[PDB]
Amino acid sequence: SNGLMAKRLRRELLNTYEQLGKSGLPFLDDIGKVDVKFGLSLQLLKSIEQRGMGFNSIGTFKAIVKLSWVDTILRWDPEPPFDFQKIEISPDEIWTPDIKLFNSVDLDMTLDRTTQAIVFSNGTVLWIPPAVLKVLCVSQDDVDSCHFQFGSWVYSVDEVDIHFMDDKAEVLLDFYQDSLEILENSAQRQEVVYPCCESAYVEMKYLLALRSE
Amino acid sequence: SNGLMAKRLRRELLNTYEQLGKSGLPFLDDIGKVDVKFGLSLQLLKSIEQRGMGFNSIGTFKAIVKLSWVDTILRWDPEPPFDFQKIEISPDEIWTPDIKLFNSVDLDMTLDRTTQAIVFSNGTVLWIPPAVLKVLCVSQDDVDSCHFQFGSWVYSVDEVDIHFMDDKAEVLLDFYQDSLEILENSAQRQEVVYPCCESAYVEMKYLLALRSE
Amino acid sequence: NGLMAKRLRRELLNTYEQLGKSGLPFLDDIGKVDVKFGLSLQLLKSIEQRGMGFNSIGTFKAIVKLSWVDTILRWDPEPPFDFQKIEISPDEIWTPDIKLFNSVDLDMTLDRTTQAIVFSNGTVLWIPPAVLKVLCVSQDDVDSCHFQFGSWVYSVDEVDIHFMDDKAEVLLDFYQDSLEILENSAQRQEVVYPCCESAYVEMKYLLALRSE
Amino acid sequence: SNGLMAKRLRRELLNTYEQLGKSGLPFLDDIGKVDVKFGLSLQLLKSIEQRGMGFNSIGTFKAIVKLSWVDTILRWDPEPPFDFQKIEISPDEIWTPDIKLFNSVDLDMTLDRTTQAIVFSNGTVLWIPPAVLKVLCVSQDDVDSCHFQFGSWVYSVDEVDIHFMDDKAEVLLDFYQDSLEILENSAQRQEVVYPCCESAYVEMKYLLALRSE
Amino acid sequence: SNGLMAKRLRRELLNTYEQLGKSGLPFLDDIGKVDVKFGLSLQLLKSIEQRGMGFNSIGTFKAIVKLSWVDTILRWDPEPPFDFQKIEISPDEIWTPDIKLFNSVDLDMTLDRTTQAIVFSNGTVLWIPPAVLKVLCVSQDDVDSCHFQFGSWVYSVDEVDIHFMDDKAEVLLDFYQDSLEILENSAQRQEVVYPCCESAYVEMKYLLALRSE
Ligand SMILES: *[C@@H]1O[C@H](CO)[C@@H](O[C@@H]2O[C@H](CO)[C@@H](O[C@@H]3O[C@H](CO)[C@@H](O)[C@H](O[C@H]4O[C@H](CO)[C@@H](O)[C@H](O)[C@@H]4O)[C@@H]3O)[C@H](O)[C@H]2NC(C)=O)[C@H](O)[C@H]1NC(C)=O
Ligand SMILES: *[C@@H]1O[C@H](CO)[C@@H](O[C@@H]2O[C@H](CO)[C@@H](O[C@@H]3O[C@H](CO)[C@@H](O)[C@H](O[C@H]4O[C@H](CO)[C@@H](O)[C@H](O)[C@@H]4O)[C@@H]3O)[C@H](O)[C@H]2NC(C)=O)[C@H](O)[C@H]1NC(C)=O
Ligand SMILES: *[C@@H]1O[C@H](CO)[C@@H](O[C@@H]2O[C@H](CO)[C@@H](O[C@@H]3O[C@H](CO)[C@@H](O)[C@H](O[C@H]4O[C@H](CO)[C@@H](O)[C@H](O)[C@@H]4O)[C@@H]3O)[C@H](O)[C@H]2NC(C)=O)[C@H](O)[C@H]1NC(C)=O
Ligand SMILES: *[C@@H]1O[C@H](CO)[C@@H](O[C@@H]2O[C@H](CO)[C@@H](O[C@@H]3O[C@H](CO)[C@@H](O)[C@H](O[C@H]4O[C@H](CO)[C@@H](O)[C@H](O)[C@@H]4O)[C@@H]3O)[C@H](O)[C@H]2NC(C)=O)[C@H](O)[C@H]1NC(C)=O
Ligand SMILES: *[C@@H]1O[C@H](CO)[C@@H](O[C@@H]2O[C@H](CO)[C@@H](O)[C@H](O)[C@H]2NC(C)=O)[C@H](O)[C@H]1NC(C)=O
Ligand SMILES: CN1[C@@H](CC(=O)c2ccccc2)CCC[C@H]1C[C@H](O)c1ccccc1
Ligand SMILES: CN1[C@@H](CC(=O)c2ccccc2)CCC[C@H]1C[C@H](O)c1ccccc1
Ligand SMILES: CN1[C@@H](CC(=O)c2ccccc2)CCC[C@H]1C[C@H](O)c1ccccc1
Ligand SMILES: CN1[C@@H](CC(=O)c2ccccc2)CCC[C@H]1C[C@H](O)c1ccccc1
């Protein structure tokens, strides 16, 4: 259709978020559970720097994080004059899951939020930003072992669920471009109880071990 | 019970802040005293780096800070159509305590202010952001000793009070993930008078000592 | 007239202010944008060995050249709007989401304060300074580095990319360094990614430098 | 007398700044001379790093800067319902002196501009932000000697004057927490003519010498 | 004569820029040529670091850049009640020359854009921001040789012209505070043709050589 109508479609969809704010689960009727599909694709190691004279180190990684979830506020009927299958939207203009790298040595991993998300007419959002992750590794016997723990900061399992995208319970290596040998690569979804709260939080925990250089 | 109603509730609660601004103690009626509950949870040590050739060092820590206080502006009756016991709100849309790390070697500790706070119907706010803390430690005889001093920057004890969350006067280790041995761990609340002002300011002072690597 | 120029800009940008900058730059039928892309190397900031292995982080200063057609920004160049071109800030218009895929950081950085020039026919030419950081191979006194550029979310049906002036190599028009260039080639390829059926256009540059 | 009236007071005072902007000397009526009271309190040294192999070094300091001046735009009569002796305001919502660290090795010192200023009913503003200062020091014979030159960037002495807070011509040690021996500590106010301008500029020049570690 | 009237004048001057935007040469009638006077004042060297094991180095400098030009939009008759001969204005609220350091090893030199410009009633603007400049130098034979190339990014000589301030074709030493011996100091204004464009661009090229430490 018209490129005009595509922009108008975006503005109409975003009007709700502009008027009501981006905070809160993406439901206007019965509040349901958001199931977020999550993938972590490793590209390369930036650095691994021993901490002091001990066996630990700070591992800084370049990755691409993949996230998808359904936002019912962003649905539209794909017929004229809005006969579009999808539209691109800035992630800072919509609700996004507050999934953080809990064990970051910094505040959190950093995502490139200038990267656009794509929303399909059925409300499915797919957002695949580049990411920098910094964690505390153990460096022993020429092996560097690092873990990554992801979960929603404030939403428990009855509010935000998380599952591995495409059921792939592993660091994805589709974009891997480094020379380092991968020695261990596994991941687990677990529901973990925190002191704050009655309901468990979903943790996606990845274990990655690389041969030291 | 509707998601729409939760979003409208938030907008109604935040209208006061939007109209009149976030600045000023969080009271509709006679300005009283905010009682902040404060907790510090150590996750890990990013780095400890000797300053020059002396016995001092810059210690950089990853922690989670727990903050709770009452905002009487954010109160509502949990009855239909606003039958919600709590809601999530961005901390940058409401008043938050100006609690700073006084002895930071930088301007202040940094908190992840993208982290959402939860507000309960009685106005209780609970906000638990990740934090990075950089302080000057003493590194002597296989021990690294660091202190952390927290307090409201501008509000005296008659305006903002602070007490240890759950009355635990210590660094909390519920999220501790590092391999360092903790040799000392204590904290104390004191009211301190400074040259600027007649009224005292509340200081939460934590002392932490770790076995060196 | 100066006033007419500012008003022309405001008229042209009114669409973007009202509808937003997102979405392919078409007002009528949505076609394909064809971005012309150029990379001009100015200098190496640093190349730092990673650990004790044969890789290094290479940090480069370059100038990126981008041109495309935005049909929303067209005007008839007749009085009082008798202007062949105007200057516009890149953050006021759509710009292609071309990223350095293999950056060791989130992305390359471009100086987005640099103004773009838009001609009356809607052609935008924007030539920002850039800093690029990639993982190189440093072995046998040769530092080998690659750069992969492409639209992040738009496939070849939406955003295509071709070398500016058909020159499939790092441009040396602004080269101001002492390092000897041992290899300098580039390729346009359409690559299929896991996410999507339609291929994505990758501009891949190979650069090798004599080590210092 | 209530929290709502305090915010309405703030909104009324700030209306002038919102409608007309923060630029310009802070006078409601005739433009007079601002007299800034200035204090510098050294907390600690973050680092001192030799430059090359010479006698100079980059000294990076954590300090607290104290600033007071009068803003006649922000005056009110403390009579009910605006019976407040003071209110807190963000420094980015009002005029603040453009006092910069002239000899910074970076663009300028950095101040924590999230810290609130306090404005009293007579228009006196007191703002005491933490600060990070980085200057070029001389490091010779076991002594590190550093200087700090502060002054308004664009306002001459007939527009913005500066004097030492409490008339103390020295680096204040009220907040000093470091283990370094202070060997020299002095300050002097002088009026200095720069080539740009007929009228002189007020320079607050502090000299600090510390024993090397 | 009064503080509120000075703000009203600024608001009226800036109205054009707020309504029409800051982009485009500062003319409302016939579009002419802007003549920028440019001065570079070296204060000190932050660092000079050898690149690898070769003969080049990264030189990081603190300077003050002096810029003057005429903005015919910001003119006014200095008569009551706008009897002000100059006003201070934020450089982010008016057109400024897009003069960049072409050979910066970073994206560009950085200027402190919080620093106010002063506009005189005849439209002459004078803006003198602190600056940090990072360039690639040659370090050989105990001499560090560095060059600085400045010019407007998008405007050719027909649109923006540049000349040395006070006719001095050299790095100005009016603010020089460093101990380094300056062995070479010269500068040249040249019209350089670029591949993009028919009209030439004005380059101000400075040559500076220092004795190594
Ligand atoms: C406003 O609403 C909020 C949320 O509903 C509410 O906060 C909650 O209060 C309960 C009960 O006071 C807290 O439960 C406590 O948790 C801690 C740690 O788990 C315990 O130490 C407490 O133990 C009790 O027994 C102690 C000794 O006998 C007593 O000294 C103490 O007072 C306790 O009764 C207790 O289990 C809970 O932590 C919060 N929950 C949250 C999420 O905030 C608050 O009470 C309401 N405020 C008002 C003013 O009504
Ligand atoms: C929108 O309008 C703009 C402005 O008019 C327009 O930009 C112009 O494009 C033309 C044509 O591409 C440019 O003219 C050419 O520049 C190239 C430089 O590489 C020359 O090679 C061309 O010379 C010819 O002869 C060459 C061999 O000797 C041939 O290889 C070539 O095919 C040419 O026939 C020719 O001079 C012109 O420089 C710009 N103008 C400006 C001001 O930048 C743009 O093309 C329009 N956009 C679209 C999509 O049409
Ligand atoms: C505008 O309002 C401000 C804020 O109220 C006001 O500044 C304050 O002035 C008071 C009174 O001068 C100051 O309070 C004094 O501080 C000194 C030093 O600490 C004390 O010595 C004083 O105590 C007494 O003893 C003195 C000597 O014996 C007596 O001379 C005096 O009368 C006292 O009995 C006293 O507490 C206060 O420090 C400042 N506060 C600030 C933040 O500036 C200012 O004066 C007002 N300006 C105008 C023009 O009215
Ligand atoms: C637009 O207005 C601005 C601001 O007023 C104006 O710039 C200023 O011009 C004045 C006066 O022309 C300059 O002041 C002079 O500077 C020089 C060198 O420092 C001195 O020689 C001058 O001293 C006097 O004595 C001279 C004989 O020795 C006389 O010939 C001379 O007239 C003087 O009486 C005098 O101090 C000043 O440098 C600038 N200031 C700035 C910030 O630019 C500008 O000229 C006006 N533009 C136009 C086109 O009218
Ligand atoms: C929402 O719509 C999208 C687009 O149709 C659905 O995703 C595509 O589904 C097809 C058929 O299974 C797959 O081959 C594609 O891989 C999907 N496209 C993309 C871009 O991923 C999506 O499944 C729908 N969501 C729901 C919840 O039904
Ligand atoms: C549990 N959550 C926070 C919860 C909160 O802020 C909160 C909860 C309830 C009310 C107010 C605030 C507290 C701090 C820890 C954090 C953990 C993260 O979920 C998480 C869970 C599982 C894997 C990775 C990350
Ligand atoms: C006391 N406070 C500031 C007070 C102020 O800005 C202020 C006060 C009154 C008026 C105007 C400004 C001045 C600088 C020190 C700071 C200290 C912090 O409170 C604090 C106290 C205890 C532990 C941690 C932090
Ligand atoms: C393929 N693209 C993203 C596509 C996407 O986000 C997306 C697509 C469809 C829906 C939602 C999101 C996924 C992550 C990889 C990225 C790669 C980049 O294009 C690219 C291609 C070629 C050279 C350089 C860069
Ligand atoms: C003098 N001032 C600037 C003045 C200006 O921008 C200016 C003035 C008038 C018109 C246009 C610009 C020029 C550059 C130096 C700077 C110095 C600072 O004041 C200062 C003075 C004393 C101690 C510390 C700092």
Ligand SMILES: CN1[C@@H](CC(=O)c2ccccc2)CCC[C@H]1C[C@H](O)c1ccccc1
């Ligand atoms: C020439 N200029 C840019 C011109 C442009 O963006 C442009 C021009 C015309 C249309 C669209 C974009 C291209 C990249 C190089 C740059 C150089 C700078 O002028 C300059 C010249 C002399 C000294 C310092 C700086």
